[PDB]
Amino acid sequence: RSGYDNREIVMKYIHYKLSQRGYEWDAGDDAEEGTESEVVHLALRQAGDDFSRRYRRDFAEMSSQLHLTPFTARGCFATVVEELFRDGVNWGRIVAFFEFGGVMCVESVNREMSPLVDNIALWMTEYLNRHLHTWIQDNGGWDAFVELYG
């Protein structure tokens, strides 16, 4: 159920990323079927915004690098992510991962490929629980990250 916490973190982050640009999307399971999801969201959001300003300084906006189809999406996610983390995991890399994930969702809605949002969420969840969890647990878990953004 450490996996579930990672899933709900992903679900809330994407929900707000889309909510704030006028598309509604909700995949939380907390019920029906200051919570970790909410507080991690806020840090992820602040740390990802610092990222973006840095990024966009120097480079074109990431949405223009995607190319954007229901066929290409899996390859796109997998190629960038594996590239990002190939020689290691750290907090800023994890921050960029989530930021990257977010613009993919945002672009998917843009490109009238809304359902892709749901694929990206579950790709992000399983990448976390398969490849990022151990490192995060070893570095004080998510609680250590939120406290860096107090």
Binding site: R54, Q65, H67, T72, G75, T79, L84, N90
Partner: peptide
């Protein structure tokens, strides 16, 4: 069948740009 090399290059390129912008602590 198929992703164009042209698009694959862009993802490679995107990944490296991302990595160059990472601060370790966040």
């Amino acid at each position: 069948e198929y992703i164009k090399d042209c698009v694959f290059k862009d993802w490679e390129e995107l990944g490296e740009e991302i990595r160059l912008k990472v601060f370790v602590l966040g």
